[PDB]
Amino acid sequence: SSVRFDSVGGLSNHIAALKEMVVFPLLYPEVFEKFKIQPPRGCLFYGPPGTGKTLVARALANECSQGDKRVAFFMRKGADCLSKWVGESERQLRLLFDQAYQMRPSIIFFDQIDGLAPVRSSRQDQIHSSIVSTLLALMDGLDSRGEIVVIGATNRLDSIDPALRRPGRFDREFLFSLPDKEARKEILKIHTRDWNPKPLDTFLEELAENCVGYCGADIKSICAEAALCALRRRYPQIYTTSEKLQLDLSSINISAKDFEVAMQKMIPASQRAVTSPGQALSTVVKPLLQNTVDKILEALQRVFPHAYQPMSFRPRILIVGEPGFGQGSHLAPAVIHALEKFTVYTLDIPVLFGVSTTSPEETCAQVIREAKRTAPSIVYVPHIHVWWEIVGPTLKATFTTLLQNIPSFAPVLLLATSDKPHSALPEEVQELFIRDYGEIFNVQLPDKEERTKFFEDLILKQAAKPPHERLKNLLKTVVKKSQNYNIFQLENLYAVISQCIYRHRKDHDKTSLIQKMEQEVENFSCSR
Amino acid sequence: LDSSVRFDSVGGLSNHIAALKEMVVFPLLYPEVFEKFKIQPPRGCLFYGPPGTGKTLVARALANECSQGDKRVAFFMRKGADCLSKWVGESERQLRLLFDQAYQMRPSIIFFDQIDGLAPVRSSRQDQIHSSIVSTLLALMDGLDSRGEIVVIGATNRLDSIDPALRRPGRFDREFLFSLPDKEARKEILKIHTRDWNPKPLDTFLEELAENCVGYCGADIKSICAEAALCALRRRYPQIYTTSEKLQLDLSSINISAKDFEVAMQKMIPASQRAVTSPGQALSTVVKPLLQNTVDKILEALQRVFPHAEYQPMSFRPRILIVGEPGFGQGSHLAPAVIHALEKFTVYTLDIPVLFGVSTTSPEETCAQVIREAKRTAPSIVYVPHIHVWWEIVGPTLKATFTTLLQNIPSFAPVLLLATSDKPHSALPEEVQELFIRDYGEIFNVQLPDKEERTKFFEDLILKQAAKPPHERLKNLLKTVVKKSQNYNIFQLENLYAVISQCIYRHRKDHDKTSLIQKMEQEVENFSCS
Ligand SMILES: Nc1ncnc2c1ncn2[C@@H]1O[C@H](COP(=O)(O)OP(=O)(O)OP(=O)(O)O)[C@@H](O)[C@H]1O
Ligand SMILES: Nc1ncnc2c1ncn2[C@@H]1O[C@H](COP(=O)(O)OP(=O)(O)OP(=O)(O)O)[C@@H](O)[C@H]1O
């Protein structure tokens, strides 16, 4: 009862839209007399789980409860109005709507309406069709319900009777989506506000950009796993006894390493049932391909200028390379990760076919509807030289005519990759990418500069640790030998050279494992 | 209850009020015409249609037109099913009371709002209470012991989920369709909801509005007015949302203009296309000066073959096939614009993402459903875009269904078949070639726009926007663009347009030009497409 639009970070247009349905007709009643208005009194929250849909209703209740113009608040769970006797289910609804009419102004909040108002079908019990009919007949009927603001919250929007969604019943619909890098930082400032050792802004700014895919609840949860980790690290004897000890509340300060352990043990809620098709370069491969990622992002910026309003025409790009250059394995997911705040919808083999009781066409038809709705979006088809060889002609005819229906100036990017050059691709694909327009990117192998930094830290610093003139020669030899390896062979040779280092952890003296490195780099053969 | 609604705001529905005052008003006013022939006029209706169209508004107007009048017809109003009761025989008994109380105060009206929640179709799998309350509702509407002078009315959104024994001449002998308004009917709802305003809006402005509100239904038209007023209030006082306090605002600088009716229609989705998109869209503001004339020519050809696009106009198997080269924008820009121009005709689509896009339904079952629906509600369109591909994507069972179902249609039924193709007519298969009879006028050939069309396309962008503060060589650039882009199709044209708009965007904040004009010049010079 102490949350008042203060803890709600990242959602500011929704709150502004919400104080003109509830607050303004009470504060400025003479503006709505000039035009005879009666502003909208129906909204519908929807989105993925954890994204601030119940926090906003809580804050609005507390905002209107404490003030001059006291408003009521009636709260309902999913389907708690159901009774077993044949006339009582829809008598409790009539009772609730009439009780709210003598308290007005009031607010009726329906939490999780997915279980109250399904689409009326004959293949179910009458109890649901009767409840929906009375609900819609009571909301907007012959009686002018009055100053009652009805709100509902849901995850599954399209499973609600389409007669409830029209001006007069549920006028406005509100999308609560995952936070971007700038709202994650607001949420982090909120949840780490009354802390003894107030964290710096430059630290929260680095945290907000590492917690990609998080949503509200996940940030609030790491802000607590960090404290539990600090506690466990400071007092290891608190898990081997069954009584209260003298906990010194002064040496329990939270450090960055605790946040690191918290973020290492935790998976966000969004990618728990699925996996995201976008992943940053590992810390090993990062000093090898970030320059290529930057070049691809510049090409995108040329074709997809959403990365006066920017105007883009059929945003499309095709990343081509040789098999092994890592364009569908390291590069395109890193570009997808760099372009977060744009929702991604993959169409690849283990997604069309790796799920049954749904056709490939029914998934290809929905991943484009949802991409048109939430534009600017991305539609990801990797390895099209095989994707186009593992699909039927019905799926080709559906796909190639579903992106011909997208508006001419639709901010929807089609990103794809291939191993065979653009000329070796079949027809009907060479006409989707028009490199006269800059819709083709040709990857090339990393330069010497990058290849040296790929190996330096391994062969120089971690080479001779705790528990120096020949190592330069070894590094030069390694970089000279591998001037034509692709990426797979490069990182293979990286693990082979790191193996010897591991078997000599307990050796206090070097010069015995240097021969190991010499012979391992010598007897390492590839292909190419 | 509001006592001010009395057939004054119910714009658009005049053929229903006229049929509704000869069931209630006339047997009281002229009770000698009905005992000349001894006819006993119809005393049953059934309102139905899409959500938000004037079904309940007409009942709210009838209640007032009869209560506050000479004669005293009584009104009984029931919501979905509020006759149900907890104890055993009490659900049915209540109904009888409602019909007896109505018999003692006759003449009277009973109005069942959302009657599809009271009287479903009787099925042996559901509760016995519903199957036994339908059989007692339809035993006291028309059984022995004549009803009397009660007028029963029922309003619903699902018509075919009502027991078919109720839809009968003697229980519900008149079904009324409340469909989406057309243009002339939207420019009456608009004059009703802005009836008592300040500086009353011009009829020319209300016509400009009624043209752009396609897909709106009564409630959306009433809602855009509120949204426009709110947008104006926000535009005038931006500091009225950052105080949570009462302030002093002069109720005179808050006049509603245009550009607030225009921003309201951005964040507004009609109720009809909120879960499914219609296959008809008008030309965007960019492409319009490039293809409106082609749309008009197509509509003239339609006028020839489909006379119902102005005795009576008589037609015979109205068909047309819009052919053009690939890229000429006939199945992507033109056919939906022709569909959108022909509103007030119902439009069904038969294309791949719709046949092979929904499961648990045969592909040759939807094809049999849409043709039946189109027959039922003629004049109607059946839209098959890209038949040069549609024909090589369906099986022979679906072909034998489709070609023999468009023959079962009566000859003079105004059901139009609209299709497009990229292959010329000669390159199509025979079984399709023989469905269009060019010597009959059933083929239209598209051609590239002319110099005039291209000049008007590029003019306002190269001339009146390149200056745009945050004149003799701009016209030379315009001439060069209109020259070099003379063998392009529409995709390449509207691609060059976006390529030139990306420069102007990049050079927003530069107060001085001549860094934008040479940029423009090199961009147009470097553009290569074919
Ligand atoms: N913008 C935010 N600022 C602070 N905390 C947030 C924010 N968004 C979400 N949270 C945290 O997430 C919790 C859930 O909010 P809410 O439950 O309304 O989301 P939801 O969409 O209802 O989730 P679900 O759909 O699973 O019910 C809150 O208790 C809050 O701690
Ligand atoms: N012809 C009209 N003239 C003026 N207003 C109209 C008209 N038609 C509809 N409306 C608006 O629509 C609102 C009511 O909708 P309606 O009376 O059609 O019930 P309904 O919403 O159709 O029932 P359901 O919920 O099944 O759709 C009214 O408030 C009215 O402002």
Side-chain angles (χ1 to χ4, degrees), chain A residues 38-81:
Chain A
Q38 278 169 45
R41 301 197 162 104
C43 62
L44 182 50
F45 302 165
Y46 71 106
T51 46
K53 297 178 298 307
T54 313
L55 175 71
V56 167
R58 191 181 306 144
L60 172 82
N62 281 327
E63 208 82 33
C64 285
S65 156
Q66 325 147 348
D68 262 347
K69 227 39 124 173
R70 166 176 314 131
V71 205
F73 201 88
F74 305 86
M75 210 275 301
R76 310 291 275 176
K77 310 297 214 171
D80 60 357
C81 79

Short mmCIF file of all heavy atoms in Angstrom, two decimals, chain A residues 38-81:
data_model
loop_
_atom_site.label_atom_id
_atom_site.label_comp_id
_atom_site.label_asym_id
_atom_site.label_seq_id
_atom_site.Cartn_x
_atom_site.Cartn_y
_atom_site.Cartn_z
N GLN A 38 -17.92 12.13 -22.43
CA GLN A 38 -17.90 10.86 -21.72
C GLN A 38 -16.70 10.03 -22.16
O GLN A 38 -16.84 9.14 -23.01
CB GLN A 38 -19.21 10.09 -21.91
CG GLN A 38 -20.30 10.54 -20.97
CD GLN A 38 -21.65 9.97 -21.33
OE1 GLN A 38 -21.78 8.78 -21.63
NE2 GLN A 38 -22.67 10.83 -21.32
N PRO A 39 -15.52 10.33 -21.65
CA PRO A 39 -14.27 9.71 -22.14
C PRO A 39 -14.31 8.20 -22.04
O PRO A 39 -15.21 7.63 -21.41
CB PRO A 39 -13.22 10.30 -21.20
CG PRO A 39 -13.96 10.53 -19.94
CD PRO A 39 -15.30 11.05 -20.38
N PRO A 40 -13.34 7.51 -22.64
CA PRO A 40 -13.36 6.04 -22.62
C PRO A 40 -13.12 5.49 -21.23
O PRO A 40 -12.25 5.95 -20.50
CB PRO A 40 -12.21 5.66 -23.57
CG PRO A 40 -11.32 6.83 -23.52
CD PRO A 40 -12.21 8.01 -23.44
N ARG A 41 -13.90 4.48 -20.88
CA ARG A 41 -13.83 3.85 -19.57
C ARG A 41 -13.55 2.36 -19.68
O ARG A 41 -14.04 1.56 -18.89
CB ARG A 41 -15.11 4.11 -18.78
CG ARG A 41 -15.40 5.57 -18.60
CD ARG A 41 -16.41 5.81 -17.51
NE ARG A 41 -16.36 7.19 -17.05
CZ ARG A 41 -17.25 8.12 -17.37
NH1 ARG A 41 -18.27 7.82 -18.16
NH2 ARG A 41 -17.13 9.35 -16.90
N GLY A 42 -12.76 1.98 -20.67
CA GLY A 42 -12.40 0.59 -20.83
C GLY A 42 -11.04 0.43 -21.46
O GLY A 42 -10.76 0.99 -22.52
N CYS A 43 -10.18 -0.34 -20.80
CA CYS A 43 -8.87 -0.67 -21.32
C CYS A 43 -8.60 -2.14 -21.08
O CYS A 43 -9.31 -2.81 -20.33
CB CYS A 43 -7.78 0.20 -20.70
SG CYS A 43 -7.61 0.00 -18.95
N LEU A 44 -7.57 -2.65 -21.74
CA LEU A 44 -7.23 -4.07 -21.66
C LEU A 44 -5.71 -4.19 -21.71
O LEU A 44 -5.11 -3.92 -22.75
CB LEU A 44 -7.87 -4.84 -22.81
CG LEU A 44 -7.65 -6.34 -22.85
CD1 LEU A 44 -7.97 -6.94 -21.53
CD2 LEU A 44 -8.54 -6.93 -23.91
N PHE A 45 -5.10 -4.60 -20.61
CA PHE A 45 -3.66 -4.84 -20.56
C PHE A 45 -3.34 -6.21 -21.13
O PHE A 45 -4.05 -7.18 -20.87
CB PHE A 45 -3.15 -4.76 -19.13
CG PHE A 45 -3.42 -3.46 -18.43
CD1 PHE A 45 -3.28 -3.37 -17.07
CD2 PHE A 45 -3.77 -2.33 -19.13
CE1 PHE A 45 -3.51 -2.20 -16.41
CE2 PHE A 45 -4.00 -1.15 -18.47
CZ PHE A 45 -3.87 -1.08 -17.11
N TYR A 46 -2.25 -6.31 -21.89
CA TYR A 46 -1.80 -7.62 -22.34
C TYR A 46 -0.32 -7.57 -22.66
O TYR A 46 0.25 -6.51 -22.91
CB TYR A 46 -2.60 -8.10 -23.56
CG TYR A 46 -2.32 -7.36 -24.84
CD1 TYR A 46 -1.58 -7.94 -25.85
CD2 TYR A 46 -2.82 -6.09 -25.04
CE1 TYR A 46 -1.32 -7.26 -27.01
CE2 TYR A 46 -2.57 -5.42 -26.20
CZ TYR A 46 -1.82 -6.00 -27.18
OH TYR A 46 -1.57 -5.32 -28.34
N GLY A 47 0.30 -8.75 -22.65
CA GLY A 47 1.71 -8.86 -22.92
C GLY A 47 2.28 -10.17 -22.40
O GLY A 47 1.55 -11.08 -22.03
N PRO A 48 3.61 -10.29 -22.40
CA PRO A 48 4.25 -11.49 -21.85
C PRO A 48 4.30 -11.44 -20.33
O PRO A 48 3.98 -10.41 -19.72
CB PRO A 48 5.65 -11.44 -22.46
CG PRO A 48 5.86 -10.06 -22.82
CD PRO A 48 4.55 -9.50 -23.20
N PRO A 49 4.68 -12.55 -19.68
CA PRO A 49 4.68 -12.58 -18.21
C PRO A 49 5.80 -11.77 -17.58
O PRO A 49 6.95 -11.82 -18.02
CB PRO A 49 4.83 -14.07 -17.90
CG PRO A 49 4.33 -14.75 -19.09
CD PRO A 49 4.74 -13.91 -20.24
N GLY A 50 5.45 -11.04 -16.53
CA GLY A 50 6.40 -10.35 -15.69
C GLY A 50 6.63 -8.90 -16.01
O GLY A 50 7.54 -8.30 -15.43
N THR A 51 5.83 -8.29 -16.88
CA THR A 51 6.18 -7.02 -17.50
C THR A 51 5.42 -5.83 -16.93
O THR A 51 5.28 -4.82 -17.61
CB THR A 51 5.98 -7.10 -19.01
OG1 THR A 51 4.72 -7.71 -19.28
CG2 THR A 51 7.07 -7.91 -19.65
N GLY A 52 4.92 -5.93 -15.71
CA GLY A 52 4.35 -4.77 -15.05
C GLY A 52 2.88 -4.54 -15.25
O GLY A 52 2.43 -3.39 -15.19
N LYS A 53 2.10 -5.59 -15.46
CA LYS A 53 0.66 -5.43 -15.62
C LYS A 53 -0.09 -5.45 -14.30
O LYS A 53 -1.15 -4.82 -14.21
CB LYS A 53 0.09 -6.53 -16.52
CG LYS A 53 0.61 -6.49 -17.92
CD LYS A 53 0.05 -7.61 -18.74
CE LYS A 53 0.46 -8.91 -18.16
NZ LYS A 53 1.93 -8.99 -17.98
N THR A 54 0.40 -6.14 -13.26
CA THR A 54 -0.34 -6.02 -12.01
C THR A 54 0.19 -4.88 -11.15
O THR A 54 -0.56 -4.33 -10.34
CB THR A 54 -0.33 -7.33 -11.24
OG1 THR A 54 -0.66 -8.41 -12.12
CG2 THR A 54 -1.35 -7.30 -10.15
N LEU A 55 1.45 -4.50 -11.35
CA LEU A 55 2.01 -3.37 -10.63
C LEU A 55 1.29 -2.08 -10.97
O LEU A 55 1.08 -1.23 -10.11
CB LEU A 55 3.50 -3.26 -10.95
CG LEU A 55 4.25 -2.07 -10.38
CD1 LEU A 55 4.40 -2.24 -8.90
CD2 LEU A 55 5.58 -1.99 -11.04
N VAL A 56 0.88 -1.92 -12.23
CA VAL A 56 0.22 -0.68 -12.63
C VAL A 56 -1.17 -0.59 -12.03
O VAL A 56 -1.60 0.49 -11.59
CB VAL A 56 0.19 -0.57 -14.16
CG1 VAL A 56 -0.76 0.52 -14.58
CG2 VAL A 56 1.56 -0.27 -14.68
N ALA A 57 -1.91 -1.70 -11.98
CA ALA A 57 -3.23 -1.67 -11.36
C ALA A 57 -3.12 -1.44 -9.86
O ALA A 57 -3.93 -0.70 -9.28
CB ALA A 57 -3.97 -2.97 -11.65
N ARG A 58 -2.13 -2.05 -9.21
CA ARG A 58 -1.88 -1.78 -7.80
C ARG A 58 -1.59 -0.30 -7.56
O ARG A 58 -2.17 0.33 -6.66
CB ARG A 58 -0.71 -2.64 -7.34
CG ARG A 58 -0.46 -2.70 -5.88
CD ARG A 58 0.75 -3.56 -5.62
NE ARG A 58 0.62 -4.88 -6.24
CZ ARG A 58 1.62 -5.55 -6.78
NH1 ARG A 58 2.84 -5.03 -6.79
NH2 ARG A 58 1.42 -6.74 -7.32
N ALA A 59 -0.72 0.28 -8.38
CA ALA A 59 -0.36 1.69 -8.22
C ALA A 59 -1.55 2.59 -8.47
O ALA A 59 -1.72 3.61 -7.79
CB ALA A 59 0.78 2.05 -9.16
N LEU A 60 -2.40 2.25 -9.44
CA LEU A 60 -3.56 3.09 -9.72
C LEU A 60 -4.59 3.02 -8.60
O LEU A 60 -5.19 4.04 -8.23
CB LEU A 60 -4.19 2.67 -11.05
CG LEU A 60 -5.52 3.30 -11.44
CD1 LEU A 60 -5.32 4.65 -12.06
CD2 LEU A 60 -6.26 2.39 -12.39
N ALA A 61 -4.81 1.82 -8.05
CA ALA A 61 -5.67 1.70 -6.88
C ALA A 61 -5.17 2.60 -5.76
O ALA A 61 -5.94 3.37 -5.18
CB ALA A 61 -5.72 0.25 -6.41
N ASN A 62 -3.87 2.52 -5.45
CA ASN A 62 -3.34 3.34 -4.36
C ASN A 62 -3.32 4.82 -4.70
O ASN A 62 -3.34 5.66 -3.80
CB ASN A 62 -1.93 2.87 -4.01
CG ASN A 62 -1.94 1.65 -3.15
OD1 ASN A 62 -2.84 1.46 -2.34
ND2 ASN A 62 -0.94 0.80 -3.32
N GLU A 63 -3.27 5.16 -5.98
CA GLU A 63 -3.25 6.56 -6.38
C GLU A 63 -4.62 7.20 -6.23
O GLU A 63 -4.73 8.36 -5.82
CB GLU A 63 -2.76 6.70 -7.82
CG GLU A 63 -2.09 8.01 -8.11
CD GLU A 63 -0.65 8.01 -7.67
OE1 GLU A 63 -0.01 6.94 -7.73
OE2 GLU A 63 -0.15 9.08 -7.26
N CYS A 64 -5.67 6.47 -6.58
CA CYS A 64 -7.02 7.01 -6.47
C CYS A 64 -7.63 6.82 -5.09
O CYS A 64 -8.60 7.50 -4.76
CB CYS A 64 -7.92 6.38 -7.53
SG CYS A 64 -7.63 7.01 -9.19
N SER A 65 -7.07 5.93 -4.27
CA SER A 65 -7.60 5.72 -2.93
C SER A 65 -7.25 6.87 -1.99
O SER A 65 -8.08 7.29 -1.18
CB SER A 65 -7.08 4.40 -2.36
OG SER A 65 -7.10 4.42 -0.94
N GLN A 66 -6.03 7.37 -2.11
CA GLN A 66 -5.58 8.48 -1.27
C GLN A 66 -5.62 9.80 -2.03
O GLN A 66 -4.69 10.15 -2.75
CB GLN A 66 -4.16 8.22 -0.75
CG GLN A 66 -3.87 6.75 -0.46
CD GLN A 66 -2.42 6.38 -0.73
OE1 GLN A 66 -1.68 7.15 -1.34
NE2 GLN A 66 -2.02 5.20 -0.27
N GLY A 67 -6.71 10.54 -1.85
CA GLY A 67 -6.88 11.82 -2.51
C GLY A 67 -8.24 12.44 -2.27
O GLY A 67 -9.13 11.81 -1.69
N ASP A 68 -8.41 13.69 -2.71
CA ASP A 68 -9.67 14.40 -2.55
C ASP A 68 -10.84 13.59 -3.11
O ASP A 68 -11.75 13.20 -2.38
CB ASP A 68 -9.61 15.77 -3.22
CG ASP A 68 -9.30 16.89 -2.23
OD1 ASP A 68 -9.39 16.64 -1.01
OD2 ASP A 68 -8.98 18.01 -2.68
N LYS A 69 -10.81 13.36 -4.42
CA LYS A 69 -11.87 12.60 -5.08
C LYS A 69 -11.68 11.11 -4.85
O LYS A 69 -11.11 10.40 -5.68
CB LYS A 69 -11.89 12.90 -6.58
CG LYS A 69 -13.27 13.18 -7.14
CD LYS A 69 -14.11 13.99 -6.16
CE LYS A 69 -14.62 15.27 -6.81
NZ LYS A 69 -15.57 16.00 -5.92
N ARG A 70 -12.16 10.63 -3.71
CA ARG A 70 -12.04 9.22 -3.35
C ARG A 70 -12.81 8.31 -4.30
O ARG A 70 -14.02 8.47 -4.50
CB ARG A 70 -12.51 8.99 -1.91
CG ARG A 70 -12.74 7.53 -1.56
CD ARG A 70 -13.13 7.37 -0.10
NE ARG A 70 -12.26 8.15 0.78
CZ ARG A 70 -12.71 8.96 1.74
NH1 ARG A 70 -14.01 9.09 1.94
NH2 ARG A 70 -11.85 9.63 2.49
N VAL A 71 -12.11 7.34 -4.88
CA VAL A 71 -12.72 6.39 -5.80
C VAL A 71 -12.67 4.99 -5.20
O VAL A 71 -11.78 4.69 -4.39
CB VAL A 71 -12.01 6.38 -7.17
CG1 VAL A 71 -12.95 5.90 -8.26
CG2 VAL A 71 -11.47 7.77 -7.50
N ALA A 72 -13.61 4.14 -5.58
CA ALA A 72 -13.65 2.79 -5.06
C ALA A 72 -12.76 1.87 -5.89
O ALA A 72 -12.17 2.28 -6.89
CB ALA A 72 -15.09 2.27 -5.03
N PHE A 73 -12.66 0.62 -5.47
CA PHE A 73 -11.87 -0.36 -6.21
C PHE A 73 -12.39 -1.75 -5.91
O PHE A 73 -12.40 -2.17 -4.75
CB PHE A 73 -10.38 -0.25 -5.86
CG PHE A 73 -9.48 -0.84 -6.90
CD1 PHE A 73 -9.04 -0.08 -7.96
CD2 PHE A 73 -9.09 -2.16 -6.83
CE1 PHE A 73 -8.23 -0.62 -8.92
CE2 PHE A 73 -8.27 -2.70 -7.79
CZ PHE A 73 -7.85 -1.93 -8.83
N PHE A 74 -12.82 -2.45 -6.95
CA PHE A 74 -13.31 -3.82 -6.84
C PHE A 74 -12.38 -4.73 -7.63
O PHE A 74 -12.08 -4.45 -8.79
CB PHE A 74 -14.75 -3.92 -7.34
CG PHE A 74 -15.69 -2.98 -6.65
CD1 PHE A 74 -15.85 -1.69 -7.10
CD2 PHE A 74 -16.41 -3.38 -5.55
CE1 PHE A 74 -16.69 -0.82 -6.46
CE2 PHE A 74 -17.26 -2.51 -4.91
CZ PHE A 74 -17.40 -1.23 -5.37
N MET A 75 -11.92 -5.80 -6.99
CA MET A 75 -10.88 -6.65 -7.54
C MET A 75 -11.41 -8.06 -7.69
O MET A 75 -12.02 -8.60 -6.76
CB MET A 75 -9.64 -6.65 -6.64
CG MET A 75 -8.33 -6.86 -7.36
SD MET A 75 -7.92 -8.59 -7.62
CE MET A 75 -7.89 -9.19 -5.93
N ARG A 76 -11.19 -8.66 -8.85
CA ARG A 76 -11.65 -10.01 -9.14
C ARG A 76 -10.50 -10.83 -9.67
O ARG A 76 -9.72 -10.36 -10.50
CB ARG A 76 -12.78 -10.00 -10.16
CG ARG A 76 -13.90 -9.05 -9.84
CD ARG A 76 -14.66 -9.53 -8.63
NE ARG A 76 -15.69 -10.50 -8.98
CZ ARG A 76 -16.45 -11.13 -8.10
NH1 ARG A 76 -16.30 -10.89 -6.81
NH2 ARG A 76 -17.36 -11.99 -8.51
N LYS A 77 -10.38 -12.06 -9.20
CA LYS A 77 -9.41 -12.99 -9.73
C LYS A 77 -9.95 -13.57 -11.03
O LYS A 77 -10.87 -13.01 -11.64
CB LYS A 77 -9.07 -14.07 -8.71
CG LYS A 77 -8.71 -13.54 -7.34
CD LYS A 77 -7.46 -12.70 -7.37
CE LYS A 77 -6.69 -12.87 -6.07
NZ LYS A 77 -5.35 -12.24 -6.12
N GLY A 78 -9.37 -14.67 -11.49
CA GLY A 78 -9.73 -15.21 -12.79
C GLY A 78 -11.21 -15.39 -13.03
O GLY A 78 -11.80 -14.64 -13.80
N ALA A 79 -11.83 -16.36 -12.36
CA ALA A 79 -13.23 -16.68 -12.57
C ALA A 79 -13.93 -16.95 -11.25
O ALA A 79 -14.68 -17.91 -11.11
CB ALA A 79 -13.39 -17.88 -13.50
N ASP A 80 -13.68 -16.10 -10.26
CA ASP A 80 -14.17 -16.36 -8.92
C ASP A 80 -15.66 -16.06 -8.75
O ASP A 80 -16.16 -16.13 -7.63
CB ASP A 80 -13.36 -15.55 -7.91
CG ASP A 80 -13.44 -14.06 -8.15
OD1 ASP A 80 -14.08 -13.64 -9.13
OD2 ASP A 80 -12.87 -13.30 -7.34
N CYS A 81 -16.37 -15.74 -9.83
CA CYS A 81 -17.79 -15.43 -9.77
C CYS A 81 -18.66 -16.64 -10.05
O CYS A 81 -19.88 -16.49 -10.15
CB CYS A 81 -18.13 -14.31 -10.75
SG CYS A 81 -18.29 -14.84 -12.46
#
